[PDB]
Amino acid sequence: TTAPKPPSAFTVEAQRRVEAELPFADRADFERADRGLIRRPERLLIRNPDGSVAWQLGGYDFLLDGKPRDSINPSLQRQALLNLKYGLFEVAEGIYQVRGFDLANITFIRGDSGWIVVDTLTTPATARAAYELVSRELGERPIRTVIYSHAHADHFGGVRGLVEPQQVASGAVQIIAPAGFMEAAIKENVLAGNAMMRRATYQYGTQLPKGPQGQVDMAIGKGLARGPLSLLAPTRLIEGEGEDLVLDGVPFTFQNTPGTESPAEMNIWLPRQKALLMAENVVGTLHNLYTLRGAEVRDALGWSKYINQALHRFGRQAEVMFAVHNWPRWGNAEIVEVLEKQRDLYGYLHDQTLHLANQGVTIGQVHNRLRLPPSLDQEWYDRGYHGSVSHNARAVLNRYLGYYDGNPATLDPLSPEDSAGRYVEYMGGAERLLEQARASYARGEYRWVVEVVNRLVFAEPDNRAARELQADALEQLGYQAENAGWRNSYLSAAYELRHGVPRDQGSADALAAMDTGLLFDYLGVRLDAGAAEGKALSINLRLPDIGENYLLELKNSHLNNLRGVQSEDAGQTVSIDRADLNRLLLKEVSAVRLVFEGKLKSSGNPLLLGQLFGMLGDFDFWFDIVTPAA
Amino acid sequence: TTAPKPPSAFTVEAQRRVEAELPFADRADFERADRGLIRRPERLLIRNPDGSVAWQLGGYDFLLDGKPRDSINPSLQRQALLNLKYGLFEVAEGIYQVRGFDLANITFIRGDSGWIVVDTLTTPATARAAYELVSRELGERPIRTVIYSHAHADHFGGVRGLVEPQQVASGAVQIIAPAGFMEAAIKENVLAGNAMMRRATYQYGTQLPKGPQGQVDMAIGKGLARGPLSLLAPTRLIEGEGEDLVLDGVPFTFQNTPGTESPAEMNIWLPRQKALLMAENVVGTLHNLYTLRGAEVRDALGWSKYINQALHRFGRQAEVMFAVHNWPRWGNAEIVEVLEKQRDLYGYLHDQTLHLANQGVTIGQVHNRLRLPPSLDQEWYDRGYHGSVSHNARAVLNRYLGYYDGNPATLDPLSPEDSAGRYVEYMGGAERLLEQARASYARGEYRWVVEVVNRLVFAEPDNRAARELQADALEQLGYQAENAGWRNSYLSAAYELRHGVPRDQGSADALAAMDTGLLFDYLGVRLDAGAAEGKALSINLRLPDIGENYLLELKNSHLNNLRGVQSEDAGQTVSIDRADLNRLLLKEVSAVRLVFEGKLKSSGNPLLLGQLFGMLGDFDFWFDIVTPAA
Ligand SMILES: CCCCCCCCCCCCO
Ligand SMILES: CCCCCCCCCCCCO
Ligand SMILES: [Zn+2]
Ligand SMILES: [Zn+2]
Ligand SMILES: [Zn+2]
Ligand SMILES: [Zn+2]
């Protein structure tokens, strides 16, 4: 069968254990999530200009009765329902948020003559919808300032839904961001982007239905709205430790926390309302030190210290703490306790992972040994809905010691598809393997089953009996999973094992923000080494609009670029505005028209740039993950 | 049997293949390594003040005839012999090096009135021995300036063998380093230090004899001298991009390359001799993007660009290039070609790893797919003696995508000791497993054997037949290994499987260089969470000599420290000079004597600091690696 199966007796037992172990009697979040509600629109259906749907919430109606479903981890089901508390809310005097219009929240702070807005959602249509709700309930005001709390797309993505370049150019609107914003907004998504985006189909469960045996939540929100990605450059940067500014009569203290949840990030303290906006440093979950879709590892230590710094500066005196995801927390004692526990959560993960590592516990063991102490374990905002204790501990370890467990048995490993046939042969052939795996499956040993049956799938990818058993076991693990990313991954893997990978199949703002060096670095990543072999060429590239020059050198099957250097011996010198190069790579203009408009100029050998571009390859999106390359 | 076995017919075949595939007819390095030889002392035996031996070379006599030994990869054997070309050499007019007195080289540059010395070896006795050889052959001169090329112990470790603090304090001697030196010298060795040092016993093969079936070389040198680690703070830092200075009449151009082989590193150009000293950016091997002992991953991209920057600034005009490890290369065309190929080597590894990753190739596959192009493959200085193509490719991948392969079968893995019993049961029990593994072994399938028999060892660690077969297969892989670290790891693992882990079992300068925040971070890593559970305490710590204050807070089984903060509600306030705290942790003084000298003062509850220290645990050095914890 290729449809989801019911939860097994073991999965059911696992859900009852969760209820036994976690403080469900602490229901305070349900009152917190509804506090200050001004309007929850009856439905939410947000549409893009091209007619697609940006966002949605009706697919989540199954969650509304609050009835526990054994195909959902009851802790995750609690979070899933809390994330359904959407609409326009009051946080404090003159501070509002729109939650559940997208993955993130959008915040509106009343200035004397209009709004200061913190963050802008993922896509213009969701930001625009949030702004329309605000205007309907609170009266229309102009937006005078937009603040990006940090350099992630679920925060800057929707800016064009709120403001247009002409307003930024007139000085009608300011855009404020932490120093480092523009680099950080783009960099981490580029060089390994195709890998990350494909792997993210698992994390986000993009092929799963919304429902009890599909996608149910995404921890820091319901999921991510779909539509155009926009981005407008900051007009003012908050530098150094932070800054105190007054915006439209309202005092703001900005505290930079670079290198925590994002390389460019800042907390916001509002002294008049005693309101502490913790950016994405403190949300209603354990966050990722390592995003499963693939990314650099984050620094739990700095993360912990910056929360401590915010505690000692503001926690002190805060009457409400709130954030760019999830709901606020009111009352000084509560705020102090949340700050301490989150400081100690990232600190414990860091320190105790290292403590174990220093005792010989490896990257292949640490998640099965490290456990939070009761005081940290027993808070809802410490649960692993988004990050997990397990995958965070391995990330800390990977950060300090790397991927290699120190045992040379594992130093030069055969690819899984190359050892798989022998594992199957040693276990008696596929039928014998299946027979023993089915018995293990019947004992509820799903974490073992998915490991060993994965061998048979990699050896025999067209063995439907193996794919089906492996899917079944993954699905049970997904049902059991507290972490929304783990759930979506397990169910996505089960889906592809059962059905196969899909065979049927801008952003201009994002490209414009990309540094030219990084762009060239990306082109080097696209280079087909087979095509490049034995070639050598060099091109002086001049970009007059941005006043940069690059020297491009292809040699030894590698593309180099160097800023600020030109070579008297380059084979060709090309001049093109960066704006026009961008139009080229986005196919908004032809090379030929550009030459004819005198917008692309060349001296030397006219053919080299075309030769170089002719060597650049492309990446297919839907690569195989749960089987070897087909 | 528990003694090394001869190379198998397959290993022998593997060595003949190496000879077929690599340009052994290119013997130019042998003339390069002997060029400018002034004196090769007949023996080298260097002793420490405590009577130990620092260094070694007589144990390498087996290599001297140049006869190929089938238990050594012939490429590694070539390198091993080249690294035996030790003594005092002329590089250019007034530029000398002592090579083979330690892992690194020490360089002596003739000033008008004494020496400028670049780097200082690992330990004072080896630096002192190098200096004595210099004085014997070239005449005694004072050392007026010491330059640290970068922040690694094999470069700063021996400084006290050359100069003493009193000379630095009088201004008789200057010590020059790249900005960032003092942080970088210490930081990366602290938090996970016990893990790294134990794992390094494998990489360095510290338990192996010197000989054809033991340790033969360490790629960038013969091995590391053993003795006290010294460190003296720089008196002048090279900031920004670099600087041009004149030292004792000699012009120097310093080019910083932060974040390449070390976070603080600089190339040196000497315009009068047209001599280019490439720090540890370019040595006679592919270097590590990831050191197997365990470390953060390095940035191949920046590494590649900085070599390109040095090429375009100096390569241009260089008549000799030399380095802090291995031998020089003379002649402009040769220098230009080495710089290009090394730039493209790190660039190819970076770009092509990402190219593959973007196609779906995972961290578990990439090393079995990525291969250098011929132009890079066919140079001796590109061979993987120190770094490897294989482990570097996985590191690039780990850096961008992390440890997780995207396949949820592997998302929540059982520890090896917990799945091992089932692997053994599925394969028919230990005897059946051994039977099939011995047949695979007889086919020379050593990379498979070590994977599968490792399962049986982890299930049954006292199964001597399994340990013995696993050792045999690892040993063959070690014989075959071109990489000196891989060889030493494989033979070390074989040694422990056969014999067991050893059951019989300062640096004051290094501690003094450690930032106080990092020291406190380390103490938090030592915290026993079991002992800390349920406790809360806070201590204001004041360190008057360095004019720093810290707030220490223990809560939620985590130790926090915050620089520059004090709390009016701390339970205790302690004042102690940092110098004295250091003496305490190095047991050079008692807490009690310090109090009695008025060097440790307290107000508030006098017991808290002792309570905190009482919760701090210790790490055993000899943890198990090739078996589960005993
Ligand atoms: C194409 C795969 C669709 C999944 C969306 C993944 C993009 C994540 C960016 C938003 C989160 C920012 O931290
Ligand atoms: C205690 C284990 C002995 C092995 C020595 C490992 C220390 C490496 C430091 C020297 C290399 C600097 O990059
Ligand atoms: Zn974010
Ligand atoms: Zn976010
Ligand atoms: Zn080094
Ligand atoms: Zn070195």
Coordinates of N, CA and C in Angstrom, one line a residue, chain B residues 150-320:
Chain B
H150 N 52.1 33.0 12.2 CA 50.7 32.7 12.5 C 50.6 32.0 13.8
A151 N 49.3 31.8 14.3 CA 49.0 31.5 15.7 C 48.9 30.0 16.0
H152 N 49.9 29.3 15.7 CA 50.0 27.8 15.9 C 51.2 27.5 16.8
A153 N 51.1 26.5 17.7 CA 52.1 26.1 18.6 C 53.4 25.6 17.9
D154 N 53.4 25.1 16.7 CA 54.6 24.7 16.1 C 55.4 25.9 15.5
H155 N 54.8 27.1 15.8 CA 55.5 28.3 15.3 C 55.8 29.3 16.5
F156 N 55.0 29.3 17.6 CA 55.3 30.2 18.7 C 55.9 29.4 19.9
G157 N 55.8 28.1 19.8 CA 56.1 27.3 21.0 C 57.5 27.3 21.6
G158 N 58.4 27.6 20.7 CA 59.8 27.6 21.1 C 60.4 28.9 21.5
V159 N 59.6 29.9 21.5 CA 60.1 31.3 21.7 C 61.1 31.5 22.9
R160 N 60.8 30.9 24.0 CA 61.7 31.0 25.2 C 63.1 30.4 25.0
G161 N 63.2 29.6 23.9 CA 64.6 29.1 23.6 C 65.4 30.2 22.9
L162 N 64.7 31.3 22.5 CA 65.4 32.3 21.8 C 65.5 33.6 22.5
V163 N 64.5 34.0 23.3 CA 64.5 35.2 24.0 C 63.9 35.1 25.3
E164 N 64.2 36.0 26.2 CA 63.5 36.0 27.6 C 62.8 37.3 27.8
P165 N 61.7 37.3 28.7 CA 60.9 38.4 28.9 C 61.6 39.7 29.2
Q166 N 62.7 39.6 29.9 CA 63.5 40.8 30.3 C 64.0 41.6 29.0
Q167 N 64.4 40.8 28.0 CA 64.8 41.5 26.7 C 63.6 42.1 26.0
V168 N 62.4 41.5 26.1 CA 61.2 42.1 25.5 C 60.9 43.4 26.3
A169 N 60.9 43.3 27.6 CA 60.6 44.5 28.5 C 61.6 45.6 28.3
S170 N 62.9 45.3 28.1 CA 63.9 46.4 27.8 C 63.8 47.1 26.5
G171 N 63.1 46.4 25.5 CA 63.0 46.8 24.2 C 64.2 46.3 23.3
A172 N 65.0 45.5 23.9 CA 66.1 44.8 23.1 C 65.6 43.9 22.0
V173 N 64.5 43.3 22.3 CA 63.9 42.3 21.3 C 62.4 42.8 21.1
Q174 N 62.0 42.8 19.8 CA 60.6 43.0 19.4 C 59.9 41.7 19.0
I175 N 58.6 41.6 19.2 CA 57.9 40.4 18.8 C 56.7 40.9 17.9
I176 N 56.7 40.5 16.7 CA 55.8 41.0 15.7 C 54.8 39.8 15.3
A177 N 53.6 40.1 15.2 CA 52.6 39.1 14.9 C 51.4 39.7 14.1
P178 N 50.7 38.8 13.4 CA 49.4 39.3 12.7 C 48.4 39.7 13.8
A179 N 47.7 40.8 13.6 CA 46.5 41.1 14.5 C 45.6 39.9 14.6
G180 N 45.1 39.7 15.8 CA 44.3 38.5 16.1 C 45.2 37.4 16.7
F181 N 46.5 37.5 16.8 CA 47.4 36.5 17.2 C 47.0 35.9 18.6
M182 N 46.9 36.7 19.6 CA 46.7 36.1 21.0 C 45.4 35.3 21.2
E183 N 44.3 35.9 20.7 CA 43.1 35.1 20.7 C 43.3 33.7 19.9
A184 N 43.8 33.8 18.7 CA 43.9 32.6 17.9 C 44.9 31.6 18.4
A185 N 45.9 32.0 19.2 CA 47.0 31.2 19.7 C 46.4 30.1 20.6
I186 N 45.4 30.5 21.4 CA 44.8 29.8 22.5 C 43.4 29.2 22.2
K187 N 42.5 30.0 21.6 CA 41.0 29.7 21.6 C 40.7 28.3 21.1
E188 N 41.1 27.9 19.9 CA 40.6 26.7 19.3 C 41.1 25.4 20.0
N189 N 42.0 25.5 21.0 CA 42.5 24.3 21.7 C 41.9 24.0 23.1
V190 N 41.0 24.9 23.5 CA 40.5 24.9 24.8 C 39.2 24.1 25.1
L191 N 38.1 24.5 24.4 CA 36.8 24.0 24.9 C 36.7 22.5 24.7
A192 N 37.2 22.0 23.5 CA 37.1 20.6 23.3 C 38.5 20.0 23.3
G193 N 39.4 20.5 24.2 CA 40.8 20.1 24.2 C 41.1 18.7 24.5
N194 N 40.4 18.1 25.4 CA 40.7 16.7 25.8 C 40.4 15.8 24.6
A195 N 39.2 16.0 24.0 CA 38.8 15.3 22.8 C 39.9 15.3 21.7
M196 N 40.3 16.6 21.4 CA 41.3 16.8 20.3 C 42.6 16.2 20.6
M197 N 43.1 16.3 21.9 CA 44.4 15.7 22.2 C 44.4 14.2 22.2
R198 N 43.3 13.6 22.6 CA 43.3 12.1 22.6 C 43.2 11.6 21.1
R199 N 42.3 12.3 20.4 CA 42.2 11.9 19.0 C 43.5 12.2 18.2
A200 N 44.2 13.2 18.7 CA 45.6 13.4 18.0 C 46.6 12.3 18.3
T201 N 46.4 11.5 19.3 CA 47.3 10.4 19.5 C 47.2 9.5 18.2
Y202 N 46.1 9.4 17.6 CA 45.9 8.7 16.4 C 46.6 9.3 15.2
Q203 N 46.2 10.6 15.0 CA 46.7 11.4 13.8 C 48.3 11.4 13.8
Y204 N 48.8 11.6 15.0 CA 50.3 11.7 15.1 C 50.9 10.4 15.4
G205 N 50.1 9.3 15.6 CA 50.6 8.0 15.9 C 51.6 8.0 17.0
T206 N 51.2 8.6 18.1 CA 52.1 8.8 19.3 C 52.5 7.4 20.0
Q207 N 51.7 6.4 19.8 CA 52.0 5.1 20.4 C 52.8 4.2 19.4
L208 N 53.0 4.6 18.2 CA 53.6 3.8 17.1 C 55.2 3.9 17.2
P209 N 55.9 2.8 16.8 CA 57.3 2.9 16.7 C 57.5 3.7 15.4
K210 N 58.7 4.3 15.3 CA 59.2 4.8 14.0 C 59.7 3.5 13.2
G211 N 59.2 3.3 12.0 CA 59.6 2.1 11.2 C 58.6 1.9 10.1
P212 N 58.9 1.0 9.2 CA 58.2 0.7 8.0 C 56.7 0.2 8.3
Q213 N 56.4 -0.3 9.5 CA 55.0 -0.7 9.8 C 54.5 0.1 10.9
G214 N 55.2 1.3 11.2 CA 54.7 2.3 12.1 C 54.7 3.7 11.5
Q215 N 55.1 4.7 12.3 CA 55.1 6.1 11.9 C 56.3 6.3 11.0
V216 N 56.2 7.1 9.9 CA 57.3 7.3 8.9 C 57.5 8.8 8.6
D217 N 56.5 9.6 8.9 CA 56.5 11.0 8.5 C 55.2 11.7 9.0
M218 N 55.2 13.0 9.0 CA 54.0 13.8 9.3 C 53.7 14.9 8.2
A219 N 54.2 14.6 7.0 CA 53.7 15.4 5.8 C 54.4 16.7 5.7
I220 N 54.1 17.6 6.7 CA 54.7 19.0 6.7 C 56.0 18.9 7.5
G221 N 56.4 17.8 8.1 CA 57.7 17.6 8.7 C 57.7 16.1 9.2
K222 N 58.7 15.7 9.9 CA 58.9 14.3 10.4 C 57.9 14.0 11.5
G223 N 57.5 15.0 12.3 CA 56.7 14.8 13.5 C 56.9 16.0 14.4
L224 N 56.4 16.0 15.6 CA 56.4 17.2 16.4 C 57.3 17.0 17.6
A225 N 58.2 17.9 17.8 CA 59.1 17.7 19.0 C 58.2 17.8 20.3
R226 N 58.7 17.1 21.3 CA 58.0 17.0 22.6 C 58.8 17.9 23.6
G227 N 58.1 18.8 24.3 CA 58.6 19.4 25.5 C 57.7 20.6 25.9
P228 N 58.2 21.4 26.8 CA 57.4 22.6 27.3 C 57.0 23.5 26.1
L229 N 55.7 23.9 26.2 CA 55.2 24.9 25.3 C 55.4 26.3 25.9
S230 N 56.1 27.2 25.2 CA 56.2 28.6 25.6 C 55.5 29.5 24.7
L231 N 55.3 30.7 25.2 CA 54.5 31.8 24.5 C 54.8 33.1 25.1
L232 N 55.3 34.0 24.3 CA 55.4 35.4 24.7 C 54.6 36.3 23.8
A233 N 53.9 37.3 24.5 CA 52.9 38.1 23.8 C 53.7 39.0 22.7
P234 N 53.0 39.2 21.6 CA 53.6 40.2 20.6 C 53.7 41.6 21.2
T235 N 54.7 42.3 20.8 CA 54.8 43.7 21.2 C 54.3 44.7 20.1
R236 N 54.2 44.1 18.9 CA 53.6 44.9 17.8 C 52.8 44.0 16.9
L237 N 51.6 44.4 16.5 CA 50.7 43.7 15.6 C 50.6 44.3 14.3
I238 N 50.5 43.4 13.3 CA 50.4 43.9 11.9 C 48.9 44.0 11.7
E239 N 48.3 45.1 11.4 CA 46.8 45.3 11.4 C 46.3 45.4 10.0
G240 N 45.0 45.4 9.8 CA 44.4 45.6 8.5 C 44.9 44.6 7.4
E241 N 45.0 45.1 6.2 CA 45.5 44.2 5.1 C 46.9 43.7 5.2
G242 N 47.7 44.5 5.9 CA 49.2 44.3 6.1 C 49.9 45.6 6.3
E243 N 51.2 45.5 6.3 CA 52.0 46.7 6.5 C 53.4 46.5 5.9
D244 N 54.1 47.7 5.6 CA 55.5 47.6 5.2 C 56.3 48.2 6.4
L245 N 57.3 47.4 6.9 CA 58.1 47.9 8.0 C 59.6 47.7 7.5
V246 N 60.5 48.4 8.2 CA 61.9 48.1 8.0 C 62.4 47.6 9.4
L247 N 63.0 46.4 9.4 CA 63.6 45.8 10.6 C 65.1 45.7 10.5
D248 N 65.8 46.4 11.3 CA 67.3 46.3 11.4 C 67.8 46.5 10.0
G249 N 67.3 47.5 9.3 CA 67.7 47.9 7.9 C 67.1 47.1 6.8
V250 N 66.3 46.0 7.1 CA 65.8 45.1 6.1 C 64.3 45.4 5.9
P251 N 63.9 45.7 4.6 CA 62.5 45.9 4.3 C 61.6 44.7 4.3
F252 N 60.4 44.8 4.9 CA 59.5 43.7 5.0 C 58.2 44.2 4.6
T253 N 57.5 43.4 3.8 CA 56.0 43.7 3.5 C 55.3 42.5 4.1
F254 N 54.3 42.8 4.9 CA 53.5 41.8 5.6 C 52.1 41.8 4.9
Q255 N 51.7 40.6 4.5 CA 50.3 40.5 3.9 C 49.4 39.6 4.8
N256 N 48.5 40.2 5.5 CA 47.6 39.3 6.3 C 46.7 38.5 5.5
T257 N 46.5 37.2 5.9 CA 45.6 36.3 5.3 C 44.7 35.7 6.4
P258 N 43.9 36.5 7.0 CA 43.2 36.0 8.2 C 42.2 34.9 7.7
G259 N 42.1 33.8 8.4 CA 41.0 32.8 8.2 C 41.4 31.8 7.1
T260 N 42.7 31.6 6.9 CA 43.1 30.6 5.9 C 43.6 29.3 6.7
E261 N 44.9 29.1 6.8 CA 45.4 28.0 7.6 C 45.2 28.2 9.1
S262 N 45.1 29.5 9.5 CA 44.9 29.9 10.9 C 44.1 31.2 10.9
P263 N 43.3 31.4 12.0 CA 42.6 32.7 12.0 C 43.5 34.0 12.0
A264 N 44.8 33.9 12.4 CA 45.7 35.0 12.4 C 46.9 34.5 11.6
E265 N 47.2 35.1 10.4 CA 48.3 34.5 9.6 C 48.7 35.6 8.6
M266 N 50.0 35.6 8.3 CA 50.5 36.6 7.3 C 51.6 36.1 6.4
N267 N 51.6 36.4 5.2 CA 52.7 36.2 4.3 C 53.7 37.3 4.4
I268 N 55.0 37.0 4.1 CA 56.0 38.0 4.2 C 56.7 38.1 2.8
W269 N 56.8 39.3 2.3 CA 57.6 39.6 1.1 C 58.8 40.4 1.4
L270 N 59.9 39.9 0.9 CA 61.2 40.6 1.1 C 61.7 41.2 -0.2
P271 N 61.4 42.5 -0.4 CA 61.7 43.1 -1.7 C 63.2 43.2 -2.1
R272 N 64.1 43.1 -1.2 CA 65.6 43.2 -1.5 C 66.0 41.9 -2.0
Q273 N 65.6 40.8 -1.5 CA 66.0 39.5 -2.0 C 65.0 38.9 -3.0
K274 N 63.9 39.6 -3.2 CA 62.7 39.1 -4.0 C 62.3 37.7 -3.5
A275 N 62.2 37.6 -2.2 CA 61.9 36.4 -1.5 C 60.5 36.4 -0.9
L276 N 59.7 35.4 -1.3 CA 58.3 35.3 -0.8 C 58.1 34.2 0.2
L277 N 57.9 34.6 1.4 CA 57.6 33.6 2.5 C 56.1 33.4 2.7
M278 N 55.6 32.2 2.3 CA 54.2 32.0 2.2 C 53.5 31.4 3.4
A279 N 54.1 31.8 4.6 CA 53.6 31.3 5.9 C 53.3 29.9 5.8
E280 N 52.0 29.5 6.2 CA 51.5 28.1 6.0 C 50.4 28.1 5.0
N281 N 50.3 29.1 4.1 CA 49.4 29.1 3.0 C 49.7 28.2 1.9
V282 N 51.0 28.0 1.6 CA 51.4 27.2 0.5 C 52.6 26.4 1.1
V283 N 52.4 25.1 1.3 CA 53.5 24.2 1.7 C 53.6 23.1 0.7
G284 N 54.5 22.1 0.9 CA 54.7 21.0 0.0 C 53.7 19.8 0.1
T285 N 52.5 20.2 0.2 CA 51.4 19.2 0.3 C 50.0 20.0 0.2
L286 N 49.0 19.3 -0.1 CA 47.7 19.7 0.2 C 47.5 19.8 1.7
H287 N 47.0 20.9 2.2 CA 46.9 21.1 3.6 C 45.4 20.8 4.0
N288 N 45.2 20.8 5.3 CA 43.9 20.5 5.9 C 42.9 21.6 5.9
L289 N 41.7 21.3 5.2 CA 40.6 22.2 5.5 C 39.9 21.7 6.9
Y290 N 40.3 20.5 7.3 CA 39.7 19.9 8.5 C 40.8 19.0 9.0
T291 N 41.2 19.2 10.3 CA 42.2 18.4 10.9 C 41.5 17.3 11.5
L292 N 41.9 16.1 11.2 CA 41.2 14.9 11.7 C 41.1 14.8 13.3
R293 N 42.0 15.3 14.0 CA 42.0 15.3 15.4 C 40.7 16.0 15.9
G294 N 40.2 16.9 15.1 CA 39.0 17.6 15.4 C 39.2 19.1 15.5
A295 N 38.5 19.9 14.8 CA 38.6 21.4 14.7 C 37.5 21.9 13.9
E296 N 37.3 23.3 14.0 CA 36.4 24.0 13.1 C 36.9 23.7 11.7
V297 N 36.0 23.9 10.7 CA 36.3 23.7 9.3 C 36.9 25.0 8.8
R298 N 37.9 24.9 7.9 CA 38.5 26.1 7.3 C 37.9 26.5 6.0
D299 N 38.1 27.8 5.6 CA 37.5 28.3 4.4 C 38.4 28.2 3.2
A300 N 38.2 27.2 2.4 CA 38.9 27.0 1.2 C 38.8 28.1 0.2
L301 N 37.7 28.8 0.2 CA 37.5 29.9 -0.7 C 38.4 31.1 -0.4
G302 N 38.3 31.6 0.9 CA 39.2 32.6 1.3 C 40.7 32.2 1.1
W303 N 41.0 31.0 1.4 CA 42.4 30.4 1.3 C 42.8 30.6 -0.2
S304 N 42.0 30.1 -1.1 CA 42.3 30.3 -2.6 C 42.5 31.7 -3.0
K305 N 41.6 32.6 -2.6 CA 41.7 34.1 -3.0 C 42.9 34.7 -2.4
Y306 N 43.3 34.4 -1.2 CA 44.5 35.0 -0.6 C 45.8 34.6 -1.3
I307 N 45.8 33.4 -1.8 CA 46.9 32.9 -2.6 C 46.9 33.7 -3.9
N308 N 45.7 33.8 -4.5 CA 45.6 34.6 -5.7 C 46.1 36.1 -5.5
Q309 N 45.7 36.7 -4.3 CA 46.2 38.0 -4.0 C 47.7 38.1 -3.8
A310 N 48.3 37.1 -3.3 CA 49.8 37.0 -3.1 C 50.5 36.9 -4.5
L311 N 49.8 36.0 -5.3 CA 50.3 35.8 -6.7 C 50.4 37.2 -7.5
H312 N 49.3 37.9 -7.4 CA 49.2 39.2 -8.2 C 50.0 40.3 -7.6
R313 N 50.3 40.3 -6.3 CA 51.1 41.3 -5.6 C 52.6 41.0 -5.7
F314 N 53.0 39.7 -5.5 CA 54.4 39.4 -5.3 C 55.0 38.3 -6.3
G315 N 54.1 37.4 -6.7 CA 54.4 36.2 -7.5 C 55.1 36.7 -8.8
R316 N 54.4 37.6 -9.4 CA 54.9 38.6 -10.3 C 56.4 38.7 -10.4
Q317 N 57.1 39.0 -9.2 CA 58.4 39.5 -9.1 C 59.3 38.6 -8.2
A318 N 58.7 37.5 -7.7 CA 59.4 36.7 -6.8 C 60.5 35.9 -7.5
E319 N 61.7 35.7 -6.9 CA 62.7 34.9 -7.4 C 62.9 33.6 -6.6
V320 N 62.4 33.6 -5.4 CA 62.4 32.4 -4.5 C 61.1 32.5 -3.7

